[PDB]
Design an enzyme around this catalytic site. Sequence first.
Site: not given
Lengths: 198, 102, 243, 250, 244, 241, 233, 242, 244
Positions: I30-32, I47, I75
């Site tokens: 996943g996104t940070t 993010e 995330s």
Amino acid sequence: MDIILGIRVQDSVILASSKAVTRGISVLKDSDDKTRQLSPHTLMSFAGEAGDTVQFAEYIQANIQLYSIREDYELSPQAVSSFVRQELAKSIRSRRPYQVNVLIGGYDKKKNKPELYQIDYLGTKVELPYGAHGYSGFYTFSLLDHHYRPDMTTEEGLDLLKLCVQELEKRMPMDFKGVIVKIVDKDGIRQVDDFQAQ
Amino acid sequence: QFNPYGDNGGTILGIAGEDFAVLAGDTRNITDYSINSRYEPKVFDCGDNIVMSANGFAADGDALVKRFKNSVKWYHFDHNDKKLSINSAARNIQHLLYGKRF
Amino acid sequence: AGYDRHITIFSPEGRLYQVEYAFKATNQTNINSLAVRGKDCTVVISQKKVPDKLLDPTTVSYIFCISRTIGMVVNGPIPDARNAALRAKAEAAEFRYKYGYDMPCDVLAKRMANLSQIYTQRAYMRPLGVILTFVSVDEELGPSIYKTDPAGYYVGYKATATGPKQQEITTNLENHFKKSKIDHINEESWEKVVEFAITHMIDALGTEFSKNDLEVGVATKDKFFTLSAENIEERLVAIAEQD
Amino acid sequence: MTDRYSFSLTTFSPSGKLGQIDYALTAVKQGVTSLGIKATNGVVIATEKKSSSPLAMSETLSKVSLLTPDIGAVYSGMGPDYRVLVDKSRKVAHTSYKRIYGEYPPTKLLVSEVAKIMQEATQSGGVRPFGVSLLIAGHDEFNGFSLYQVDPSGSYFPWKATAIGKGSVAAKTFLEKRWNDELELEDAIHIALLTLKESVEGEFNGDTIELAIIGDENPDLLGYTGIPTDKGPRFRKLTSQEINDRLEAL
Amino acid sequence: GSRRYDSRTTIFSPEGRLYQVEYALESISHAGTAIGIMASDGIVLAAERKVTSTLLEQDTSTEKLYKLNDKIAVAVAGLTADAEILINTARIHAQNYLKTYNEDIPVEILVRRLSDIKQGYTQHGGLRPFGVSFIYAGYDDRYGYQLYTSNPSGNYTGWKAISVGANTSAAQTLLQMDYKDDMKVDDAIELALKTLSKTTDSSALTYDRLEFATIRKGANDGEVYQKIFKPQEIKDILVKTGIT
Amino acid sequence: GYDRALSIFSPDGHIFQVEYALEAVKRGTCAVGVKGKNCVVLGCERRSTLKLQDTRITPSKVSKIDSHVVLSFSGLNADSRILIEKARVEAQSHRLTLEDPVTVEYLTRYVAGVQQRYTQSGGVRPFGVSTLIAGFDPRDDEPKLYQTEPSGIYSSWSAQTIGRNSKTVREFLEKNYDRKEPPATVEECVKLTVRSLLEVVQTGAKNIEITVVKPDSDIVALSSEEINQYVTQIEQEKQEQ
Amino acid sequence: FRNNYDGDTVTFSPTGRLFQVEYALEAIKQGSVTVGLRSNTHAVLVALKRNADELSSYQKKIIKCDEHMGLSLAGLAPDARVLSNYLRQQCNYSSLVFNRKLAVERAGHLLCDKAQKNTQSYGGRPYGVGLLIIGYDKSGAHLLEFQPSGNVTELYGTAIGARSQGAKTYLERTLDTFIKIDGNPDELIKAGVEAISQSLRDESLTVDNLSIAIVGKDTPFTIYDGEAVAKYI
Amino acid sequence: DRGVSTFSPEGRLFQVEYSLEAIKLGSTAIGIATKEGVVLGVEKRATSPLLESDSIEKIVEIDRHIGCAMSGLTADARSMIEHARTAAVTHNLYYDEDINVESLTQSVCDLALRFGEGASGEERLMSRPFGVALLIAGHDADDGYQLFHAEPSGTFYRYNAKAIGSGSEGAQAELLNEWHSSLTLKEAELLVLKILKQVMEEKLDENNAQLSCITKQDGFKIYDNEKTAELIKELKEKEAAE
Amino acid sequence: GTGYDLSNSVFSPDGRNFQVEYAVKAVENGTTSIGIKCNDGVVFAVEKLITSKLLVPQKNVKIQVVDRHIGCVYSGLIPDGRHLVNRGREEAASFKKLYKTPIPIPAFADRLGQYVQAHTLYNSVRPFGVSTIFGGVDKNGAHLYMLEPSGSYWGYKGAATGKGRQSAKAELEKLVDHHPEGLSAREAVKQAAKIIYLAHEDNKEKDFELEISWCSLSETNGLHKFVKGDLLQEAIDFAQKEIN
């Protein structure tokens, strides 16, 4: 209340039940049969609360007919009366009790003896030579106490009932419009169509 | 002890013409001997050309009208936008009222 | 068939693999703890390892205050440990409410052991991968240590140890008691009992400790509490002026 | 959530065996030996306190438990399973008997209740059988003294004397030689100590052995006086000292 | 999910057989043999105690013969504990009937009820069947002396003589050979013991390995009596019939 | 709590548990039914894997649901009891609410409904039973005969059979039963029934029971002799050729 | 691999994937194409209705949820009926209890949460349908994209279904243009019909084949089918 | 094993697809809608000559203005019919009017996906999908004469003509060429009889096939055998005429 | 054998729960997102990948508030994150209703903790596919926490999870060393914006949108609020500047 009488003679049980159905100020019907055949040798008469009366009778009839088919046998009168007593005894402690009194007349083919059971709405059962529910007993039990004999014939029994009915038609306030009489013996259940003047 | 009902007064009148109909009602709302409002609408357009008024205990009147309008809305949703005939609204209303028979 | 290894049903050898594997999980944290009984106190010591520099050290603990009088140290992953701690606190509070007196250390231990036994018998529940050491100074039994495991087993101890190097600590402790001939540390102050505990921890593990490498819990009449880094430093200093 | 394991975990195999019950019996076999001997005026049950560490306090772990004042139990197999069975047994003795008849249940009936609990873990959904065998000893007015064994399947049988666990085969044989219907309690205690000695490897004394008897009433263990009909419990656990005194006459 | 560990105890095999029932029956076939023989003046129930020891208290033991009524009894073949579960519900059903009708329950009605309970574990619930087979011996005033049998499937049938458990094939053949409609209880007792005597997987048939019971209408009375023989009584009848 | 789906569809569109339920029926003793002009007859065969039974008490293969309707079956005996009981209860309930006993079709439709429900309800297996239901509608004299199977499908037949070797006995019936002239007599009807059974029972006077059902709750079962007599007269029809 | 971890929604694959959810997503790609786009005054849904035989009708793809909200579907129709129905009730609850029109943003959150529950529990299955929600609330025109995985996103325009990629690229190109088509419904629609025809291939949009829906400033959510869409073909 | 509400890698529900396979093995059913009514016809397909054919009920009345034909596991259709009849009667009690054909169909289709061992969405207690398909035909004032095809998938389509069952692919192709917006009820009847004749294994007669129709005037009626026999005869004659 | 990884609550031979470990994989994919604890509050940043020009900017908010003083970001599987916050909200409401005071961060942390841990106890449920960073201000200070799919959690000075978690952690570690006295809310915000830009290099292919929120006793009165307008741009610039 309605008239419910029963008498056990030598070889049969006779049941007499009034024919009127009164609601408030009007006699709605004068040919009401307050009885249900539970099995070929067992008859039940009933009186009490308006709707509960028939609903209870028909419910008991259904259960006995079911037992008869499942076992291909006929429960003894004593067995049937005990089943009926338990049902009434359960009812008295439920949300809305069946306010029904009954008389069970049956001929036990195994003992070869007629039997009469009186059970009130509380589940109070007793076996008697003669019985009645409601106000009827107040005038008939002393009559029968006087004129009853164990060895009476079905015919002597019918003359005894006629005597009871005449007393009821003389002293009771309500017009119950006569009674329907049925005989229970070793040959089954038959209705005496001629009592309007026997 | 708690009484779930109240009386808000008001009077309504409905007359059917040959090709029209009217439903009128005063706009006064009351409690005992006081006026709660001089202008509180009591007759409503419920859609599909049906006007309704439930007079008596206002809280109950509002709940019923509200429930019927919602009934009309669902009638459209479940029957391809079919128009609710007046006779059909009447029957629907009977079930709404009888639902609270006790 | 091979599923006798996924849920808690017997294997042909009468074994419960899931329970054995839960025992394996108790060492996942690579931490060692030990408990000893004083004359009128109970001490529990456990290594404290904070690898990540981003972690707030004050929130990393495996010791829990269950009730005013009972302490609990856990060996196993922290989430199962917190599950056990919450349940133990609730059980302790409920017991006091219903029976009118503080729940004894050994009774809470039995209750938790019974709960564990159930996970061992019912298929839908998994065992908790932890070992719980309960301590206190019971009003009837005095200083107490009771430990439970994933098999539902529990017993009282004179002293005990748990973890990867459990054995080394245990034999070290056994040797000391064969020598002293008594079932406890004959010291009046809990401070000296803590020192004895840390001392033998060092000897057995062959390691030195700073104030942030340990975690300490103490149980006294009517109270269980944990030491601060500074109370510990004070302890480390005292043991240093003996060696 | 919600237990969705509503089906049996113990089922019949093509050969007619109930695997889980057989396996539970195997767990019982690996367990420390325990035994029981019935005398003319009492019963003795005993086992070894196989301490899992010298740091552990073997007294805080009772393998022999009182179920009612005249009934005791001991086992072989899984200690934790035994512990909960004892809790349940003590409770059912009250809920199914004392709170109805105002008196403790006769030995066979309580055994019957325990047996029922164990049978259910053999058929009910989502569970495994208990991994233990029990030896229950007791006394009651109309049946006198009795000794029973209850297995993982729920089956139970009365014994004059028997052993279960590890070296049960050898111990049963040794009991068949020494048992007779004239034994007095002290004699049975003696026989019990001798039998147990063959099963024990290391130390054999009053601190490594756990033994109890169902004998005469102990008015000194009642807790009150004033009621003649209440004479005390027949169940009594021997002390470490009482056991040693008898080991010298071994 | 859980579905992974479900054995599905109540499904048909491609041949239309119920796996668990067939396997429970296989289990029954290894249990001590039980025999029931119906005579003109009574019924006999006899069973072999599976596994025994010198130390087994036989006086206080019962593993095969159980009293259900004062007029009905059963002989058990299979898991004793499963049997006790069913025996207790049967004892309840009998008392319920007596409370309702003020008459003892007819043998078949009680047998059908127990069989229906067994059938249930066969069609719903996902539980294993009871590993039990019963031989019912009872008397009622409609059919007199009766003998029935029920197994894990919930099926039941009536017999003049029958056996359940181990070696029923050999035992059934022997019974079919010496049974006679006009037999008498004492003849039946002897036939039962002889049959067990020839089918035992043991050395000899001794009293400590048996359980015996009879349902007779002791002429000097007029009522029905159940007699669950005591050790000594079995030892006696064992000598008389010439098996010593 | 147990609600596993036991009856499900397989890739080819079959429901194996229902299919295997039929296999259990094929394994059951044979049962047949033929309707005359003023009656219906039900015949069943009696196994012989074990013989030493007490015929008085052993449950018979034909059951009365009510005084004017009977039911026979092939398959698992235990399962049939469940259906028979439910049918009996439904028959009394119907008399109680409609004040008239059930018609044969109604009773059949009810039994079939129960069977279907057990093919798509969680936690239960289908009934390994097929039934034959016969009788006379109240105040009617036209004979009735229906058959139901594990799937819940039902229909009426002039004559039909189910159970082991029903394939054989059905053939006998297809080329021995004329719809133009049904067995105009209780006797010639019972004869056709016995004949069809002999095609598979292989000499079994005591392995063949029969029940005759006539209008107005007139139901009676024949005794060994009565039947044995039919067998005798039939073995002659053969030898006299 | 996959085969061992795609038995149910409660199982993670070794790489952290949920296959049952991914398979549900595949039912969307097999569904007929539908497009959605909005300006600052109106929101539009355009859908291509699919038929079975030339003797059957073209299954509807647009459902009205309230006077200010609606959606188009792609995938399992029954699941769209279940979800749109839940939304109808949520819009209903908001009006009856707070006399407030449900914010499109809130509707998206409710849909996400409802779908999520079906991806973490045993026995259930993910919804196998995609949804495009448009509406006009107190903050203007809105367009949402709903995926069975529970992911809901607010966009200026988008498309789902088979070959949906064509229309999506066209819209991602036409952005600056249609986003400004304010106060002119007919133009926004034509802009949408042009976007959808970028995913055609089989045939060409006809009169009983095209389906359009619009909502806006002074326009209650209304659906146009047949003759009513003729002027756009 | 595998859940009853599992998706295939292609995005289809296994049980529903396998359900469709069972429907393909069922008896043929055909429906044709005209501006004069809708006709429904089925193939009885008795399995033995001793089976009284008229006891085969594959065309049933839902209400006076709605009838329906089935194909596949016909026993599975009873609870569906019961639900439909109740829905229609109930609608009339609540609104004093006839339920629209489409509404009635949508209600029957709502039952379809209510299966599983514990699907999170309500309480779908039904272990498997229905193994039968239905053709619902009727008439209502808003949309006139209608024909719908209801599948175990819960989706329903409206058709001018449709065939389901073993001979559907063939029959449907035939319907594609024969149907037109101006067929009369009589033409439709013969047309159904003709197509049934082509796909049936047996020779079509008034005993192994059955017709029915629904008109605004007389509602749903099932043609008795005598009436259909004549339509059979009339069909043979027109075919032999070229 | 094998198959230990097919069911959620199963212990593998080495004492692990593979399904929880697979859940972690969904998180790493996943996104940070991050969290920074300052001298009197906390800052959260995440993010947001721009899949296409079609995503309306600033409209798909990922950071969520609980009660009025707590922020949560995560995330992994976004829906699982929302599910967790919904529970967190019910948990917070329940605590306030009974005790009146708004829920303390540590107390709230355990509430989420116990619930997440609960989903590793049965095979009837799946573990959470997210790692969550949350915190706020209470009676005695600021608190920052990170919770893993195993239900494991601890208090943090700084935390990061998702694709660029390593870059972020390296950056957070520098800050901790160069600021032993404590970072200020204003500074933490800029620093947060920078860390996300740097951590975006592990996903530099797609363009992204920055999102920040904070809770400071002095800057927001101890209430959770989003960083918008001027303060946001000023932080974006600070980052864009040090990215070169």
